[PDB]
Each structure stands twice: as structure tokens, then as C-alpha cells.
A paper describes a structure:
Alditol oxidases are promising tools for the biocatalytic oxidation of glycerol to more valuable chemicals. On the other hand, certain alditol oxidases (AldO; EC 1.1.3.41) were found to be moderately active on glycerol without being affected by the inactivating semiquinone formation. Three thermostable alditol oxidases from Actinobacteria Bacterium, Streptomyces thermoviolaceus, and Thermostaphylospora chromogena active on glycerol were discovered. The characterization of these three flavoenzymes demonstrated their glycerol oxidation activities, preference for alkaline conditions, and excellent thermostabilities with melting temperatures higher than 75 °C. Structural elucidation of the alditol oxidase from Actinobacteria Bacterium highlighted a constellation of side chains that engage the substrate through several hydrogen bonds, a histidine residue covalently bound to the FAD prosthetic group, and a tunnel leading to the active site.
AldOAb was crystallized with xylulose, the product of xylitol oxidation. The overall structural assembly is composed by 14 α helices and 14 β sheets that are organized into two distinct domains, as observed in other members of the VAO family: an FAD-binding domain and a substrate-binding domain. The planar flavin cofactor sits at the domain interface with its 8α-methyl group covalently bound to the Nδ1 of His45. The residues that compose the active site wrap the isoalloxazine on its re side. They include Gln295, Glu327, Arg329, His350, and Lys382 belonging to the substrate binding domain, and Ser103, His118, and His45 being part of the FAD binding domain. A well-ordered molecule of D-xylulose, present in the reservoir solution of the crystallization condition, was clearly visible in the electron density. The ligand is buried in the catalytic pocket, and its OH groups are engaged in H-bonds with the surrounding side chains. His350 and Lys382 are located at the bottom of the substrate site where they interact with the C1-O1 group of the D-xylulose bound in front of the reactive N5 atom of the flavin. This geometry is perfectly suited for the hydride transfer from the substrate C1 carbon leading to aldehyde or carboxylic (e.g., glycerate from glycerol) products as observed in the AldO enzymes so-far characterized. When inspecting the molecular surface of AldOAb, a noticeable feature is the presence of a wide tunnel that connects the active site to the external surface. With a diameter of about 10 Å and a length of 14 Å, the tunnel is long and wide enough to bind polyols of different lengths and sizes.
Numbering used by the authors:
A (entry chain A): 5 to 228, 239 to 426
B (entry chain B): 5 to 228, 240 to 426
C (entry chain D): 7 to 228, 240 to 282, 293 to 426
D (entry chain C): 5 to 228, 240 to 245, 249 to 250, 253 to 288, 290 to 426
Write the structure that this text describes.
């Protein structure tokens, strides 16, 4: 019926839940208009369609680990929670995960979903091949090794190349992670010490309510002195939640307690499992150089942000070569905004935000809200012409192109 | 707002999600009318209230394992999926789980939730102590060792004693379980071999559509073959109890050994339905009336199968818990996962109840039924005892909604 | 003390007439205890150093329309404070039995009325200003000091001398009050909850002679006990036999202003129990009614809502109040209380801090979850133990 | 989001763009607080509101000409760029145009926007009637002919009467205009020859950087040479490209591709602040010299200043109410803090010349004094209360400056 938040009521005629590869290939082939439905953790109409919603949650939850190549072959309908548990048990890990694990692996990689860390990509960077059902109904495989020229536009694809059934991931050895929350770092500390703070851990989040002159929280996640303590931030005495009033229970165990990578790198614990959300979201991704400038630009309109914000989160993400990846050929600073659920009021505040950041050539998070018109947005991605070439090659009728992918990427 | 099936719209004024014991104690105390809210996997008006709905999902998720006594202190908002995973990690298990893990431990035990298994009781049986917030707002502990007279009425409580915050669970060593599905057993094979079948593994499920003369599926889970010999054929790939639904949802089959918490339920940890498209009722009968009852239903299989997804038949050992459906009688379980027409199932239930009447059938407290109070109560010895415990720990009836008033507490 | 069973062993009795003067006295005196009205019955207000009244201070009463709160002199009595609050068209939720009781003295001990959804008077407090042992002002408020403010109000005057308390107000309201005579004692076994909920504030008066509740006072904001066999009173009544009805607030259902209705207007003990033990307790007490009734004027049963104030008797549990206005024979009463505390022990009872009791410390401290937090707040605000007498040392602070 | 400059961040709740009169009238009637948004070419908080910002650029762009009366009925949301090009096509013209065409007609007229020329008023004088949606949502027409007592209040209104949908303009025959730039006139030239200079063309503009005592540039626009006695494409600001500006070097062209300084195609956000003071024309030289005396404080934080002339009108809050006028315009550099210092000073040195500020550009002139400098303000306050008792269309700006006691 709706997206996780419940602001997007899907206008689809039918919701198909194929129980096999064969049953999917039939649904895709016979349907004139398809958009794959993963986890519903998007806030825009990217997943909307007047035709066929198709889930892949009901296919085999394959997770075949090849010990020789250190790579897992895994079902696109599978979520990061499950995938991680299974990978971890077998003694394998991924380099990073998003804020909660209950997010669909293909759905995440489609929109350029990311964690934080200076030397760590968006999650799609771990992908080394896809198999997808084309608009026709047959399996195509695109892999880095085999298809150098085409693979990089395959992964962060807005699910407009077809339905991905199995993604190959490069694995690392399973690892332990400790996480501490520091409170009330002074905002001015960023002006001279931004690079030192975000490098002070494997993955660092800044949380600010854009009220006053203080970074409300700083989450410093280390692979097994703290810099942000030196700079005025006090360690938190107990468990904490990024948002004011929301329970610490939900969140991954903090207070410096080492635990497995997959119960630490996300902000939310394997158990949390919210059936629904009461928030909106927008995230702008800038070149890393514009962090401070951009911080200040936003400091200038904090009086419009703070009223309708739950929390804003600031992260770093290494550059990839993935054509519609927000991290395409530029190390990045992430300006995320978990809003309160008033779309009208957030839409005003986003047009404004987009004006004050415009000098920093900001790319919006494909899954989160934005108002950046196509002309401007397309100019901010070099390889947008090469991706439109691949979408017409693999989907000439534009089966997998709803209004959103047309408007933002495909239409002239 | 609603139950997981969505047939029950809670008519509550407030939905509290306290983040601390203190915050809970304040909400309980100040609210003149409370019903706790766990996982929402009930289908009747048990969890409904005009007063204050109260989750405990927001309290610290304690799983404190005490190696010495081999027990686990666990938060009442926690669900079996999370609890199990954590218990398994530390190298511990429980004896049984329900069909899907993502059910709340306090809400499961509060209704008499159960698996299958000859020598295995309802899940509430692994409970040795409960700490709860009284209608007053203070903590009370009831344990088997400290309160032998009263503890047996406190676990399977319909949440009418107050809000349980922690539950002590006797553990076992973590164990491996293999699972095999068998297809199209002859219905007559039960008549002389029911007990031989249900005992053919640690936990055993019979799934029939109540169409014609076959048992669609038989699931035989073993701690690390009868029904083959009796004319059922091994399934060659993965399978789901209901026709149409995907095998993918379900725990790994084909006799492949796995961890207990990834086998004893039908549904794998990853399957996480946010909503359901079904109703439910389950009748629990003394084991001797298995065949007698099997036939008595077969006599109205023409009114069942129309509005039915699948019916599940299981065994449950006896316990001593006053409102447990397995209260001092080894049990045969007749489960019905209906299709979501409440008006139509209610009519089929009136009937089911009438034909099963001679077997003194106790309904599952969480699932649908229409068995009136007078009759329901007479099927429970220790109903007068529970009514006293409620009055002792909740004189004002704070935790007594119209459901618990009408079925157990009112005269 | 207003009873006269406690002779204050203080060297000096100061009555500062200015904040400045009070601040001086506190600073210069190495041992202080504040004196309200003297409506305690125990050794709580007693000290060998300096008694300090605050009755002479400016009776400030600053009603802030916006937040709907008042700022009032700790020395002010509820009678006086009420009259002023009422004239401005404001009220407090509840008042104790007589208004001529000091506001900071009341809140320090866990003073309370009756009412199912009504707290002790200390719950109406949002902030305190108090002179420390050093002579400077500290403000503790709920808003500004979440962690600490709950130890501060019901304090046993062991943190400093409170000068001004901020109260949350309601709109001023009328109240009617009817006394019913001779309810059957059995009527509580099934209808306790229904009776105590039959008004805004309800009181049960029993002489613990036979099986009758002598009187039941039912106070309503502008019904069960009539139907359960108690008869309406023909004319004005007083809770104690023989004492004149003239002393008591107007009854016979004549609507009146809250402050002329919620109060009713000897030694005293009160035990405060989880509300669920109301009937169980009421029997345990009937089971020694032969030792009570001889030395008793009247006993008063009331209900009080839970709060989060660390040494409130209502700390984290709705409450049934069992009060005993005794005949002034302390030696006799101390025998009765020792037995009473034994029969009531299973109901984990808390004593009214400002009334008599013999519950040993080790036990009394285990019936308060947040004693250690209150002990660390007194050592934070008064490390010298200026405001620590023998009472507060014995019961709460000493190790 | 912001005004064209970006110094004003709109603190509105809703930004509406009605696509019909019906839809506007609905937005107005249901909104308790409204301010219309034109082109955002203001620099103060005149357009600002905590209520409802309402563009009109999405209504029918009507341009209904009556050959008989030689008058056009035009959509308020229309810009001078568009409106001109369509007026011209039909073989009609307006007497004058502001510096660029991409300013909203009703936005222009609401603040008393103007060009240069001795015998031509501010743009608002060409308006003979308005239809506006009241705070109730119904249409009211005020016209000079029908409502003599009230109409003069209605045009230069500060958008405080209602939302103007259609304005009736008096038109002329379409005319050609040539313009020429002369460079470095001596400032002393003005001392005896100001009047002769500003009368030397249809419109004349004097650009000075307020460095020394020269006029950097004199733009002389003639319908189809005095400043020569006392020649150059060129941009009024140092460092900005000439290509942005209308075609000069005496090349004849249509009025609308000429009278503005900036060509139909430019279409730029901005990087400047603005103030303009409008003095009775006789104080030209006295004021020019009074400013030359603090030209040390000005020239630093200045792009360019423009001095122009404007005819008198009878429009109640027109800067040109009952007096021929000399315009001292300043395009400042974007440092509001620095400019607000210079304006307190400028407003003191010009005080004897009874200056009126441009309603659309910056000023620090206190209300009591500003109000004294308009005779008819008492009558505009009586009209606003007549058309908008609840003050739906009155923001902080209009209340502070004009309406509040
Ligand atoms: C609570 C929450 C936390 C979040 N945390 C983070 C975070 O920390 N970092 C971050 O970067 N983002 C984060 N996000 C954003 C989120 O990762 C994106 O919205 C994500 O891309 C949505 O994935 P989905 O599958 O849930 O959503 P959907 O709307 O269901 O799908 C997203 C897109 O993927 C496509 N897709 C899905 N499955 C397939 C498939 N098999 N083949 C092809 N295309 C497919 C769909 O067509 C659609 O276009 C968060 C979102 C939420 C709600
Ligand atoms: C998909 C599905 C699968 C199922 N599988 C099985 C199965 O295999 N076997 C079986 O026997 N049953 C099964 N059931 C039935 C189910 O276990 C019961 O309805 C059970 O009561 C679920 O409780 P809940 O907390 O999830 O729901 P709720 O309606 O929220 O809670 C049930 C009761 O528990 C009480 N409660 C919850 N938390 C507390 C607490 N902390 N303190 C006090 N009271 C509390 C509530 O007040 C309420 O009265 C299943 C149900 C579904 C929907
Ligand atoms: C006739 C009568 C009726 C009563 N009715 C009730 C009733 O209905 N309900 C009930 O609960 N109790 C009742 N009580 C008990 C009485 O209200 C309490 O004992 C109360 O706490 C005493 O207040 P006081 O002004 O007499 O203080 P005192 O006995 O003089 O002092 C008691 C405490 O107050 C402290 N104190 C006083 N002022 C300050 C200050 N400004 N700053 C710091 N500490 C201060 C002292 O330090 C001391 O610890 C009654 C008592 C009597 C005599
Ligand atoms: C680059 C530039 C050049 C300029 N050149 C000149 C110039 O040469 N001469 C000159 O005199 N001024 C000039 N100005 C100033 C400008 O002409 C005035 O500030 C003008 O009033 C603003 O027009 P706008 O449409 O941007 O108004 P806005 O800022 O959008 O709003 C201004 C006022 O118009 C009102 N309004 C707009 N439309 C309506 C309507 N339909 N009904 C009712 N009220 C309405 C608004 O409520 C507000 O009170 C210039 C400004 C800039 C930025
Ligand atoms: O990263 C995200 C969402 O993309 C979350 O951390 C939010 O910041 C809310 O906590
Ligand atoms: O039998 C049960 C227990 O309630 C179900 O979970 C089965 O899968 C039938 O749907
Ligand atoms: O309120 C009290 C004391 O708390 C009553 O006992 C009255 O004094 C009547 O005796
Ligand atoms: O905008 C105006 C008038 O308001 C012009 O003076 C420009 O500054 C020319 O550069």
C-alpha cells in the first residue's frame, strides 16, 4: 500500500510476490510497467508506478559464500540485517552498513545508500556483479571483471535496468567494532578540526538539532586520547538516541563495548524492526572540501531547519566510479536531515537549503526528498549520458522507468 | 492503532512507549485503565482498551544470562527471534518456540502460546519468575521457588495482573534440529497411528486443507521414518504449509541440520511480516480425543475448507499453570489459520465449538472463539484461584478490559 | 511543638524579618533547623543549635499568569496562601486537614489530602529557592534540574532553609462537602475503590470500635456510600467524638470555595501503604482494634496518587493512607505503634515523616529506592551537615 | 525561498502559485495572513510574511487591448519584459520602464518604481484601474474615473489592499528610442546646468561611483548635444560586462529594447543591496553636494549610484506625490551591516531636503518622520482599514512603516 514512512501511497494496480526466479521472469515479461519494490525505505515517488509493483522478498533467500574468491552471491530481496547475521556466522563481514539493517540490499544499492568513514564507499561499492531480469524476462549478468565498460552504471541504477535477483558482494573477514557517544561538542570546533574529528574513527556521525551553537551528539565507531573530547565534547554517561525524546533502546550498544561489526556500524540494533516510520528525510552529498563552508551556509538558515527537524546527521564517504552514485569521482561530506512528518513545511525548507548549498554542487540522496530540477541535477553527474545509454540498451520500452526516473534521468 | 491481522482497531485514547522502568511505573500508576501491548499477534479484543495502551518495546532490551543457574533474565517487550539469536550466540536454547519468532515473549506466555512436541509444554512453562509493575506502580516479583502457591497463575495471565517488565527463563544447552516435510498422508492412517506419528520426531505438525481424504503436509522436526511407511511421500524441494504462499518465508527443510531457533518455527528469522492477511482460532483438547475430534471436524470439513488457508494439528505436554490451555492434561491442538472474513469464520466457529463440545475444548486465548463464559470457565479448575490473584494484585481492575471482564473475572 | 510533646532543646530561636537577615543567621549558625508551624510530633524540628522561623519574612505571592504558577514564601501557611491565591482566582489541587500548616513544613514531610488522582502537596511544587549553609541562594526546578529537583521538595529541611517555592496552580473552583454516618466496615471489602472514587477527596473516619466507619466525608468538585447503608448527617459534624462541629469547614453539601472545603478545619502517626493492600491492611488493623480504640480520638483512611519525589511516602506507588489521631499519652501510643508496625510490616508501609513512628532505619531506608540519591544531594548542598539534626542523621543520612 | 538578492529569507509557511482567479480567491479567503510575491526585486522585508506567500505568475497572462480607449487590461503577475514585447507587437507603448524588464508590473507599481525623464511619472501613473481580490476573496475594481476619492490610494499600495489580478494601463503609440553614453562629465557642470542636462533627453541617467567629483557615465535616451558641450558599449558598474545592457551608440530601436538599461534576454539571483532617496527637484545640487561631503563613506561599499528625474503624480504613497523629483539611487555591495551604517548618515545629510525612500529598497528612516513627508498617508490608512480591516495583507513592514499607531 505505502512506503515505510507512509507519505507515498503507491498508485500501482497490482503487487506481485513471485515465489521463484521463473515466476518473476513471467511477471516482468507480461507486465508493460514494472517498478521492483524492496524495503520501502524511500520518501519520494522513485518506487511509485501506475502498473506493477514486484517484490523479490519471496524468492529463495540464497546467500552462497565462495571461500576461494571471498565473495557472497545473495538475493536482492534480502535485507542487510539477515544478510549480515548469515555472513557474520560464516565468519565474513561487509566494510559498512546504513543506519538500520532492515533495508533491502538492492533497494539500498539502487539509490547510493551509505554509512560514514573517510576510507569507505557507499554500500554499492562492495558489489562486483549483478544478475537481473530484463524487461524481456531473461537473466543478464553484468560484472566489473567481465563488463568493465557497463558494470559501473549497473549497480546504482534506480532500478531502471530491470529486477536484480542476485548481487555478488566482496567480503572481508568478520570484525569487532566499539562505539562511544560524545555530547555538546562546540560547533566552531569543525572550522579548524572537521577533518581530524571525522578521521578519529572508522565511521563518525555528527548529530545536531541545528538549534544554538552545539553538535548535540558525536558517535565515534572504531575497528578493534579521543580527539572530540579534547575539543570540549563530554562522553555520555549512558545509552543514547540521535533524536530528542526517541528511546536509546532502539539503538546499537554504545559505551565503548566491543561487538560484532553488524551490531555496531548501524545506529539501530538487529532487533528494532519498526513496521512503519513517522519522519521524512533529505540528504545532500557535497565534495569533502565544502564541509565547513556548507556547515556555515546551513548555520545561516538554522532558524528555518530546527523547527521541523528531528535530527541532522553529518558523515564522510570515499569516492566511487559508479555513474549515478552520489560519491561519483569525489570523496564526500553527507548533510542528512531526518525531518518531522510535515511534507508541505519540509518542501519549503528544502528549496531554501538547495539554494544555500548550490555553490557546493550538491547531489541529493536518490531515496530521500529533494526539489533540485533535472537540468541542474543532471549537470552535476558526468556519466548521466552513459547511464541513459545503458537504460535504453537494457530496457528500450522503458518498462522499469516510472515518472520519477523519466523526469530526473531519462526524459529529454 | 490495530492488531497485526488488522481486524481489531484498538479503541484506546493513548499509546504510551515508555523508554525506562520509571517512565512505565508513572504511566501505569496515573492511568485508571491499562492493557499492555506486545507484538499484536492476537485476533480477539484481548489487547483492546478505552484507556491506556502501553508498549514495553522501548525499555532496555536485557538478556542477562546467569551461567551458574543456567537461566535468562529477559525484557517482556523482547520477541522470540531476538531472544533466541542472543541465547544461541551465548550457546543456550529454549525447549520450543511458536510458528514465527517475531512474537513478544510476555504476550506469547500471556495467552498459552505453544509449539508441537509430546514431551514439550506451552512456552510459558520455561518461565520461573516475573517482575511486574502493579496497578499501584511498584514492582512485585512472583517466582516458582519463592511463591509456589501463586506463581502458576501469574505467567499465563492475559496481562490482567499488571505489566511484566522482566521474565526469568530456565535454559538448556543450544542444540541442532533437522526438519523433513512429507506430503499426502492418508487421513485414515491417523485412526490407528496418530500417536506413532506425533512421536516420530521432537516436534511434529499435521497440515490439512480439510478438502477430501489426505493430510496435505506433515513436518517432522528432530533433535540431532513412520509417516513415509504410512503412505506420505518426501517433498523434493522447499515447501510452505499454506497453498500459494512461498517456501522462501519458511525455516530450512530437507533434513539439513541447523540451529534450534532456525528450525522449530516454520518461518525463518528474516521473514518479518509488518501485517497479516489472516484470522486464527485454535482448540486444545485432551490427547485421547485426537481421532474422535479429527472425525467430528471431517463431518463439517465442507464449511471449514471454504474460508481456510491451512489447519495445523499438534501435541503439547501438560503444565500446572491455571489458565494454560494445557493445565493438567496432555493436549491435541486443532489450529485454523482462516482467510480474513471475520463475519464468515465466526459462523464456522459456532459450529466447530458445537461439534467439539464433547471433548471439553479450551480455546487459545490469543486466537478467535465464541465459547460463552459459563462453559469456558467450567473447563478450567483454577479459575476461582486466578480470580483471587487478580483481585489481590489489581483490586481496581486497572488491567481488566471488557475481554478479561467477560471471559474470566466478572460474576 | 503545637502538641507540646517535643520541647525544642535549641540555644537560639531566630525570626529574621528579611531574606538578608535570614541569610546572615544561616551563615553564622554552625547548626540550623527551620521551624514552620510546629505540627510535627517527632524529634525532626529539634536541634541543640539554631531554630530559624521564616514567619516574619515578606509574604511574597507572585502569580505569573503566563505559566499559571505562583512564587510564595516558604513561611506562608496554607490558610493565608489560599485566601490570596483564591482572591486572584487561582487554587491548588489539594490542602491538608487544617490550613494553619506551613507550606515548606508540609511539603518537607510528605503532607497530603485525599483523592484518587491527587498527589501529596509537594507535587504542586515545580521549583525551590533555598538559602544554603553558606548563606547564598540556590534555585532547583524540575525544568532546569531534572536529575536533582525530585530530592529537593520532600527534603526534611536538610538541604537548606527554603525561602520561596514555585507552585503550579489551577483555576479557582467551588466544592460541596457531605458527611455520611455509619457505613458498614464490610462495605470496604468489595467497595473500597468505588467509595474512595465517589468524590474529588474522600475520608474514612473510624473509632476502631466494633464494625462501623463512624463517618465518611465525601467532597466533590462542582455516589455509592448512601446506597451501601451510611445515612446522611442531619447537621454539622466533627471527625472526633465530643469535639465541636463549629471548628470544621461547612458541610451539608453547601457549595463553597475550594480552600474553605478541602480542609476539615493529641499525638499522630500515619502509615502509607500500596493502595492494593487497603482491605488486607484494614483487616490486619481490625485484628488489633482492641489496643487502638482505647488510646484513639479517630483514625482517617485516605488515598493519594504516586509521585517521583525520592523521600515522598507516595514515591512510585498510588497510596492508601492509615492515619491515627491518638490521645496525648506518648508512653501508651509507643506500645500500640510497635504492634501496628508489626501487623502492617508485610504491606511495606512508609511512615508520615512528620508524625510518630518507631520503624528502625535499616528497614525504613529499604522501603525508599532513592535514599542514596537523597543522601548524595544533602552532602552536595550541605557537606558540613548544618541542616542535619539527630532525626535526619539517624533515619536518612548516617551510615 | 529568498528575494532576488538573497538578503531576505522568506519566513512564510506556504508558497502558493494559483493557476486561476478562482484558486487565488480561495487561497486569499482561507489564509489569515497573505503577502503577494512578484519578482522578488525588493531588498527590505516588505514581501516577507509568517502567513501565505502567493505568486500570481501562473494565472492567465491576459493582455486585452481596447483600440477605442487606447488602454490595456493586463495580468498583475506579468513582467515588463513580456508585457512590453506584446504591447509593442500590437503597435503600442508605455511612457517609461525601470532599469530591467524582468520586474513584475504590480510589484513595480506597489513600491513606486520609475525610470528617468522630466515629463514622465513613475510606472504607477500609467495605471487607470485595478481589480484586486480583497481579504474576503471577492473582486473589487477601483478606477480613476469611477472612484476619484479612493483610486489614488490604490496603485502604490505596498500590496496591503489585496491581491491585484488585472491592472488597466493607458497606452501610447509604439515609438522608437536611440540612447547614447557620454563619459566623465564634471560634477561642477551640475551646479548651473543640472536642469538643462536632465531635460537633454526623453530619459537621462547620471551614473557616479562617488569617487572624486566626476559623473562616471551619463545615459541620454531620446525619442526619434548639451552633455557633450559640458562620448563612448558600456555597463553602469565597473567590472560588469556591457553585453548585459540594452544597445547604445545612438542605434535606433523599439522603446522597450531601449528605455531599460538591461536587454530582454539578460534574465540573471543578484549580488547587491539597494537604497534610493527621492527629493524635490530643486534640492538636486544642494543634495548632490551634501552627499559629495560623505562620498568617502559611500564609494567603498558601492557598485554605482544613479541620479534620475521623475514627474509629480497625485498617488498617496508615491515618492513623487505632489512634487517633480530627483532620484539618488545606490546599488551597494552585499554587506547589509556596512550599508546600514552609511544609510543612517545619508538620511541625516539629506534630512533638510525632506527625502522619501524607495519603498522597495533599503532605508532606516523612522516612521513618525517618514509619515510626515506624505500628506495623504492618513487617507491610505483609512482605505487599507476599509479594504482589509483584519490586516490580512499587512505584514510587520506595512504595520511599522504605514498602518500601526
Ligand atoms: C529508517 C531509515 C534509515 C536509513 N538510513 C540510511 C543510511 O544510514 N544511509 C543511507 O545512505 N540511506 C539511508 N536510508 C535511505 C534508504 O537506504 C534508501 O531509501 C534506500 O535506497 C531504500 O531502499 P528500499 O529497498 O527500502 O526502498 P524502495 O523504495 O522499496 O526501493 C528503492 C529503489 O530500489 C529499487 N530496487 C529494489 N529492489 C530492487 C531490485 N531487486 N532490483 C532493482 N531495483 C531494485 C526500487 O525500484 C527503487 O527504485 C534510510 C532510510 C530509512 C527509512
Ligand atoms: C503469525 C502468527 C503466528 C503465531 N504462531 C503461534 C504458534 O505457533 N503457536 C501458538 O500457540 N500461538 C501462535 N500465535 C498466536 C499468538 O502467539 C498469540 O496471540 C499471542 O498472544 C501473541 O501476543 P502478542 O504480544 O504478540 O500480542 P498482543 O495482543 O499484543 O498481546 C497478547 C497479550 O499479552 C499481554 N502482554 C504483552 N506484553 C505483556 C507484558 N509485558 N506484561 C503483561 N501482559 C503482556 C497483552 O496485554 C495481551 O493481553 C501466532 C500468532 C500469529 C499472528
Ligand atoms: C492539626 C494537624 C493536622 C494535620 N493534617 C495533616 C494532613 O491532613 N495530612 C498530612 O499528611 N499531615 C498532616 N499533619 C502533619 C503535618 O502537616 C506535618 O507534620 C508537617 O510536615 C508539619 O509542618 P510544620 O509547618 O508544622 O513544620 P515543623 O514541624 O515545624 O517542621 C517540620 C519540618 O519542616 C521543615 N521546614 C519547615 N519550613 C522549612 C523551610 N522553609 N525550609 C526547609 N525546611 C523547612 C523543618 O526543617 C522540619 O524538618 C497534620 C498535623 C497537625 C498538627
Ligand atoms: C536589478 C534591479 C533593478 C531595479 N531597477 C529599478 C528601477 O530602475 N526603478 C525602480 O523604481 N525600482 C527598481 N528596482 C526596485 C524594484 O523595481 C522594486 O523593488 C519593486 O517594487 C519590486 O518588484 P517585485 O515584483 O520584485 O516585488 P516583490 O519584492 O515581489 O514585492 C514588492 C511588493 O509588491 C507587492 N505585489 C507584487 N505583486 C502584487 C500584486 N499582484 N498585487 C498586490 N501587491 C503585489 C508585494 O506584496 C510587495 O509589497 C530594481 C530592483 C532590482 C533588483
Ligand atoms: O542515517 C539515518 C537515515 O538515513 C538516520 O541515522 C537518521 O539520522 C535518524 O536517526
Ligand atoms: O499454525 C500456526 C500457528 O498460529 C501458523 O503460524 C501456521 O503457519 C498456519 O498459518
Ligand atoms: O488530617 C488529620 C491528620 O493528618 C486528621 O486526623 C484530622 O486532624 C482529624 O483528627
Ligand atoms: O537597478 C537600478 C535602479 O534601481 C540600476 O541603477 C542598476 O544598478 C544599474 O547598474
Amino acid at each position: 500500500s505505502t512506503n515505510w514512512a507512509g507519505n507515498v501511497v503507491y498508485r500501482a494496480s497490482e503487487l506481485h510476490r513471485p515465489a521463484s526466479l521463473d515466476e518473476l521472469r513471467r511477471v516482468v515479461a507480461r507486465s508493460p510497467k514494472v517498478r521492483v519494490l524492496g524495503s520501502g525505505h524511500s520518501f519520494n515517488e522513485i518506487t511509485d508506478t501506475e502498473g506493477a509493483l514486484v517484490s523479490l522478498e519471496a524468492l529463495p533467500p540464497e546467500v552462497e559464500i565462495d571461500r576461494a574468491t571471498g565473495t557472497a552471491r545473495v538475493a536482492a530481496g534480502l535485507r542487510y540485517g539477515e544478510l549480515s547475521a548469515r555472513l557474520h556466522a560464516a565468519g565474513y563481514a561487509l566494510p559498512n552498513l546504513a543506519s538500520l539493517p532492515h533495508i533491502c540490499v538492492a533497494g539500498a544499492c539502487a539509490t547510493g545508500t551509505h554509512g560514514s568513514g573517510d576510507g569507505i564507499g557507499g554500500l554499492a561499492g562492495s558489489v562486483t556483479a549483478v544478475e537481473l531480469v530484463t524487461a524481456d524476462g531473461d537473466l543478464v549478468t553484468l560484472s566489473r571483471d567481465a563488463d568493465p565498460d557497463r558494470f559501473p552504471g549497473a549497480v546504482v541504477s534506480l532500478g531502471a535496468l530491470g529486477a536484480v535477483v542476485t548481487m555478488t558482494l566482496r567480503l572481508e573477514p568478520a570484525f569487532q567494532v566499539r562505539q562511544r557517544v560524545y555530547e555538546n561538542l562546540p560547533a566552531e570546533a569543525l572550522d579548524d578540526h572537521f577533518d581530524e574529528i571525522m578521521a578519529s574513527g572508522y565511521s563518525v556521525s555528527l548529530f545536531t538539532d541545528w538549534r544554538g551553537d552545539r553538535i548535540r551528539q558525536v558517535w565515534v565507531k572504531e575497528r578493534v586520547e579521543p580527539v572530540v573530547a579534547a575539543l570540549g565534547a563530554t562522553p555520555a554517561d549512558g545509552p543514547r538516541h540521535p533524536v530528542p525524546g526517541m528511546p536509546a533502546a532502539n539503538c546499537t550498544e554504545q559505551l565503548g563495548v566491543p561487538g560484532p561489526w553488524h551490531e555496531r556500524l548501524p545506529h539501530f540494533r538487529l532487533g528494532f524492526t519498526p513496521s512503519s516510520g513517522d519522519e521524512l528525510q533529505a540528504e545532500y552529498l557535497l565534495p569533502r572540501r565544502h564541509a565547513v563552508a556548507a556547515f556555515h551556509a546551513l548555520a545561516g538558515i538554522a532558524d528555518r531547519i530546527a523547527p521541523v527537524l528531528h535530527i541532522s546527521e553529518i558523515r564522510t564517504v570515499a569516492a566511487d566510479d559508479l555513474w549515478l552514485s552520489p560519491f561519483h569521482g569525489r570523496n564526500t561530506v553527507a548533510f542528512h536531515f531526518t525531518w518531522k512528518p510535515d511534507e508541505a513545511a519540509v518542501r519549503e525548507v528544502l528549496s531554501l537549503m538547495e539554494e544555500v548549498l548550490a555553490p557546493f554542487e550538491p547531489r541529493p540522496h536518490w531515496g530521500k526528498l529533494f526539489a533540485i530540477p533535472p537540468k541542474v541535477l543532471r549537470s552535476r553527474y558526468d556519466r548521466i549520458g552513459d547511464f541513459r545509454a545503458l537504460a535504453r540498451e537494457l530496457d528500450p520500452s522503458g518498462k522499469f522507468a516510472n515518472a520519477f526516473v523519466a523526469h530526473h534521468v531519462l526524459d529529454d
